[PDB]
Amino acid sequence: NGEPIIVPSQDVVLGLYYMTRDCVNAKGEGMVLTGPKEAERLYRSGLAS
Amino acid sequence: RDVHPTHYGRVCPIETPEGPNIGLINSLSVYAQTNEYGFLETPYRKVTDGVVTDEIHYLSAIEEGNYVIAQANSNLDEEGHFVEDLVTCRSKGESSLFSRDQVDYMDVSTQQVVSVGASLIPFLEHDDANRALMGANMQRQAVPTLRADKPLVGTGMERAVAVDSGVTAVAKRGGVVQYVDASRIVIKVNEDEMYPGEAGIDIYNLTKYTRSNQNTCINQMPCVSLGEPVERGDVLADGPSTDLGELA
Amino acid sequence: SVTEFLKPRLVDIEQVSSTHAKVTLEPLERGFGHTLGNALRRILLSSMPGCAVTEVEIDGVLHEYSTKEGVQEDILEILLNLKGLAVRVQGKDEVILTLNKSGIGPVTAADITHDGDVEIVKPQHVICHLTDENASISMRIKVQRGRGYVPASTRIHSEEDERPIGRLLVDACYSPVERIAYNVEAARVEQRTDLDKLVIEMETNGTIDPEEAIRRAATILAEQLEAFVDLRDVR
Amino acid sequence: EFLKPRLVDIEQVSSTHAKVTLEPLERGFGHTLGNALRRILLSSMPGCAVTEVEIDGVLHEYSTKEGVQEDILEILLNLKGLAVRVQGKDEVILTLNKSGIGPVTAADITHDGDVEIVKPQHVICHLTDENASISMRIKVQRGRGYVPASTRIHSEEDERPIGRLLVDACYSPVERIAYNVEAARVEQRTDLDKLVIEMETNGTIDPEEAIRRAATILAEQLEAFVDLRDVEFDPILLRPVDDLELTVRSANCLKAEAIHYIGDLVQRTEVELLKTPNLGKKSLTEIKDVLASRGLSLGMRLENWPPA
Amino acid sequence: VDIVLNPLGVPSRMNIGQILETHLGMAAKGIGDKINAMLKQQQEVAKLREFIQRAYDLGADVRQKVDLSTFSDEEVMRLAENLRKGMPIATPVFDGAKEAEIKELLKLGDLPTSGQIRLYDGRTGEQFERPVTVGYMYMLKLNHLVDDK
Amino acid sequence: DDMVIPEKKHEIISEAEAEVAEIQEQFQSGLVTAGERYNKVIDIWAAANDRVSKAMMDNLQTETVINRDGQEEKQVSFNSIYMMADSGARGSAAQIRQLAGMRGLMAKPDGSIIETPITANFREGLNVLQYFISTHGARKGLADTAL
Amino acid sequence: DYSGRSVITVGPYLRLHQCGLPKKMALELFKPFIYGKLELRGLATTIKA
RNA sequence: GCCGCGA
């Protein structure tokens, strides 16, 4: 059919889906950050969710 | 290769081979026996008036199709009467709801439909039928390990399976144990029961590491230490994959 | 044998530009790669000395939401640009700088008033694009040396809202580590097969060499163990 | 500008359970130090464990001894759990002999020079008849990690007599370790962290010595970061050519064709060396004959040729 | 933990017995751990007998009439020493323990009612965001080994 | 606990039972033929299955009622099983229904449908009759795949 | 021939073009190549060695 | 060839 047969499934789909979700209230609301590097920094440091 | 509605108390609906032989090979249920002529019978409890008595009749396929058979998961009272005036039942290859006075027979136990292999699966009713079949098939492929370990959660059929398989050593007329060794057990029989003349003692020679049919190991280790009072039917030595007379 | 452990030798450093580095170490004992990587990452990310801007003062309206007097860029973007500004202060805990522009043209980091004791690493860093046209902009920044990352949770200084408006709660990133990542892969030496190899990819905001950052993190972690290695020392 | 963690208020619950405390710690260093120390202590802690045994009449692990209540495999599994502490030695032989009725524990092991049994109530077998005795020799070695008996082959360099029972070795005293962090009682400082580490071992090693060893291991591992910087073999070949016992006429020929090593002559196909002046068909067959005597047929293909 | 299993196998295969057995085995091992801890301090036999009696009578109209009053003191000691690993309960096939009974058993052994505990990563030391159902499951080593494949 | 049970479930189930009783009384009055009552009981049981599945899905989808900076709000739940089904990593809505909602009308002795469906999910237990009923479909599907 | 067969497990560290092969399965499927390399580098002069 | 088993 032309659709990509190599596609992530199972844990990987759960890995991304949990990563790209939003919560109404969490650690950090309306914070303005300069780049995606800072998002990783805050997530790893435990200062953001 | 389908499950006929008459396979209730005679042939297991779960345990059967998967690929080529599905439905062509079956396992006898726990209580299923053979009639005089050769047909499968299953036990049931008689129902007189509204009280379920303890007397038991073995019903075959032809006989059980006429009476109305109650359900094992039917609550009872102190005197044996049904708590509810309405009870689920099977009349003729079906399932309906009848009054307490129309019940003819009662299912003896909840295990009646399930064979030996599927009886050791705890919370079987919470598992899918095909996955339960897979688990029952796979339980028979496990190999005995160095040390038997009891299941922390079981179904109570481990003791029956272990004792009735002949894999262990059961004291025929044991009294008090006299001598325990890693390969011998010598028991002095009690004086209450004895064969007149020549007295006598019981000697059991345990089978040590011995090749099985599947090239696995068969070993027996004693459970009694010394001077332990042993009754008739007690377990002395546990075979491969068995802990204190319990299947493991 | 006992009390003798594998030490990494012939390390590899793949420097990229002047702020990105990939330090490779091999071989390490099974499980030591994760320990070293996690400890170094946590120290480099959570507690390192550094200097970053903390307070801002813009002439005009001091509210959190402002019209920005028509400066072509919202003051939120100005704060974001100031957040990424990196400085090197010399012998002061705190220092105040001022910048003033008149005349159309983008503003840069080199355009702050010259202070001989404060060094700007990236002079062309853009903060805004001037007050649209034929107008002026004045910004007084205050930068203090700190440790790690302190988010603008609250001011808790001076009285009432004087300190909050004097600082505007600009987020501070003291630790000069823009990103730190560690990976453990499988490596073998002689007959042994289960060995760990460590890859440390670090990007720095500047003002410090990435290998210097690794050196500082390792030195502070090692000096944190003097009380246990002092008496139990080979030399 | 950082406070240094001092090992204070180390307390011992039981002969195995122990608690150690590091009072002064900064904000984020508590979890880092705790996790690093836990990984180091669980991974590699030097200790002593049983390596092999020798029973008198026992021939292999799957055998049985008359009078004992347990299989020899069960005896090996019991002896695997024996915990001892040695001083100045690494190959201590713990001979034990006893006769009678009842269990045999580590208490009846012969009192060696410098060997301490942490618990003497650790039973290893039973005797079920008066006139039977057990007598065995246990070798206890010092090691670091889990070394299975099968994977070690160096023990087979000297042939072991039939009767040496090789058991697996763990060498790790630290069975369990957990860590926790709390707020320090220091009031002059704004806030400080205190780390409490609970260790459950087999009693072989002191908790304080454990913490010191783990810290030293971590420090020596970190030392590699403090200064980054860094920014033709066969003996038959390589033999003098004047060893094949060749004729005089070939000696001048071989010198003329710059053939001084045996291996070079091997790498020549039969067709090519015919063009060499006055090679000689019969002489060539002699060259092939002597080379065939050494088993090196002409026409091989090597990769590299060192001058030596 | 000893074994790590993928949750994804449960919702698609409908093996809810997996989760129920793990929770109930966790409860049984918690009871065993309580008994082992009480045996460690060598307390009086009376209180250990009382705890065993209280644990055995737990349930909702269970047809088990095991009583330690008619049980010998040495027999009580031996029984408590035998099940120090865990209380080996038995749930029959189609009439087994309900969720309420499992939860009250968990409450008895000083364990979380939901059956999930906070788990920390062994390598990074960071707690996982969601609680993980840690239990005790009976695993079997089948006769399909790669030494023969 | 990840299989949240709709608390209205039994209610509608009871309602279904009542309706069944009524049609039985109608069949006792003789004005309804066997085929009519059979089709009607299958239809009402299917409607009950649909509504119980819908109620369970409504309960389980936006389960998280979390507060905001002001008052309280609601959002998509972080239920692990719901996250498994919604993300598409593993499972589907029908398996969700069999886990939490009623199992549904099922039968395959000859392709027909039994009048009384399985009203118990896998989170709760199944009677001997319900398991023996589901075994028909299980064996039929396994044999179909095998051949 | 030149054919092996074994049970497959999962490797999450592998690249898309890589697969883990047992070194015991290897040294058998690649025996002629090993013979050729041994003869080429002078380690073994004859095939028997 | 039968018998049992794995995907």
Beta bridge partners of F25: none
* Partner residue opposite A25 with nearest CB, options F67, F78, F87: F67
Phi, psi dihedrals of residue G41, rounded to the nearest 5° = -85, 5
Residues 6+ apart with CB under 8 A from D215: C225, C228, C229, C232, D37
The answer to whether D25 touches D34, Cβ cutoff 8 Å, is no
Helices of type H across chain F: 9-29, 34-61, 80-87, 93-99, 128-146
Tally of CB atoms within 10 A around F98:
22
- Rounded CA separation D22/D180 (Å): 11
Contact C40, C218 (CB under 8 A): yes
- Within 10 Å of residue F133's Cβ, how many Cβ atoms? 26
| Residue pair B108/B43 in contact by the 8 Å Cβ criterion | yes
Between A and C, how many CB-CB pairs are < 8 A? 31
Contact C88, C209 (CB under 8 A): no
Rounded CA–C1' distance between B58 and H5, in angstroms: 36
Taking each continuous run of H as one helix and of E as one strand, the counts in chain A are 2, 0
Measuring CA to CA, how many Å separate F123 from each of E64, F1, F120? 25, 9, 8
Q: What is the dihedral of CA E77, E79, E84, E86, to 10 degrees?
A: -160
Using alpha carbons, select from E84, E97, E86 the residue that is nearest to residue E38.
E84
CB E28 within 8 A of CB B122: no
Instruction: Please count the residue pairs, one from chain C and one from chain E, whose beta carbons lie less than 8 angstroms apart.
Output: 5
**Amino acid letter for position E56:** Y
| Among the partner residues E17, E89, E142, nearest to B126 by beta-carbon distance | E17
Nucleotide nearest to F146 (CA to C1'): H7
Closest CA to D269 of D240, D244, D247, D291: D291
Choose among D30, D11, D20, D19: nearest CA to D192. D30
CA to C1' distance (Å), from G8 to H4: 24
Q: Which residues contact C12 (CB under 8 A, 6 or more apart)?
A: C23, C24, C25, D230
Cβ atoms within 10 Å, residue F128: 23
Contact D23, D194 (CB under 8 A): yes
Separation CA C74–CA C2 (nearest Å) = 64
* Tokens (6 digits) for D265: 């002559």
**Which residues on D lie below 8 Å from G46 (Cβ)?**
295
Do chains A and B have 3 or more beta-carbon pairs under 8 angstroms?
no
Q: Which protein residues have Cβ within 7 A of any strand H atom?
A: B 17-19, 21, 25, 137-138, 141; E 144
- Of C49, C12, C58, C61, the closest CA to residue C170 belongs to C58
H2 C1' to B1 CA distance, Å: 22
Q: Where are the extended beta strands (E) located within chain E?
A: 89-90
Residue D57: both structure tokens together: 């009449």
Neighbors of chain G by Cβ distance (3+ pairs < 8 Å): D, E
Q: If residue E98 lies in a helix (H) or strand (E), which one and from where to where? A: none
- By the 10 Å C-beta count (0-12 exposed, 13-18 middle, 19+ buried), C227 is classed as middle
Left if phi > 0, otherwise alpha if psi is -120 to 50, otherwise beta: which for F135? alpha
Give the separation between CA D138 and CA D115, rounded to whole angstroms: 13
CA of B32 to C1' of H4 (A): 24
Strand B217-218 and strand B153-154: the pairing is: unpaired
Residue E104: CA atoms inside 13 Å, Cβ hemisphere, count?
12
Q: Closest protein residue to H6 using CA and C1' atoms? A: E144
Cβ neighbours around C27 below 10 Å, total: 22
- Let me know: does D181 contact D27? Beta carbons within 8 Å: no
The answer to whether the CB of D290 falls within 8 A of the CB of D246 is: yes
Residue D286 in contact with partner chain B when CB distance is under 8 A: no
**F96 and E16 Cβ atoms separated by less than 8 Å:** no
Measure the CA–CA gap between C220 and D296, rounded to whole angstroms.
Answer: 64
Is the Cβ pair D62, B208 closer than 8 Å?
yes
Residue found by looking up tokens 């040695």 in the block: D86
- In terms of Cβ atoms closer than 10 Å to its own Cβ (0-12, 13-18, 19+), residue C124 is exposed
Instruction: List the one residue out of B154, E69, D1 whose CA is nearest residue C224.
Output: D1
Mapped onto helix, strand or coil, the DSSP state of residue D99 is strand
3-state secondary structure of D287: helix
Task: Tell the burial category of B160 from Cβ atoms under 10 Å away from its Cβ (0-12, 13-18, 19+).
Answer: middle
Nucleotides of H under 7 A from a protein CB: 4-7
Q: G23 to chain E nearest CA, in Å? A: 14
Q: Alpha helices, DSSP H only, in chain B?
A: 61-64, 116-119, 129-139, 158-164
Task: Provide the token pair at C139.
Answer: 């910004």
Locus of tokens 């949240």: F4
Rounded to whole angstroms, how far apart are CA atoms D298 and D218? Answer: 59
Subunit partners of chain E (3 or more CB pairs within 8 A): A, B, C, D, F, G
Helix (H, G, I), strand (E, B) or coil at C38: helix
> Quick check: bond before C27 cis, omega within 30?
yes
CA of E13 to C1' of H6 (A): 20
The two tokens of residue E76 are 């009580």
Burial of B38 (0-12, 13-18, 19+ CB in 10 A): exposed
Going by C-beta distance under 8 Å and a sequence separation of 6 or more, which residues neighbour residue F125? B125, B126, E94, E96, E98
Task: Tell me if E124 and D34 make a contact (CB, 8 A cut-off).
Answer: no
Q: Answer yes or no: do A34 and C41 touch at CB < 8 A.
A: no
The residues pairing with D46 across neighbouring beta strands, listed in sequence order, are none
Round and report the angstrom distance from CA (D286) to C1' (H7). Answer: 64
Which nucleotide lies at the shortest CA–C1' distance from E144? H6
With an 8 Å Cβ cutoff, are E6 and A11 in contact? yes
G12 token code pair: 């999450």
Answer whether B122 sits within 8 Å of E14, measured CB to CB. Answer: no
User: Shortest CB distance from F122 goes to which of B18, B19, B126?
Assistant: B126
3 state SS of B147: coil
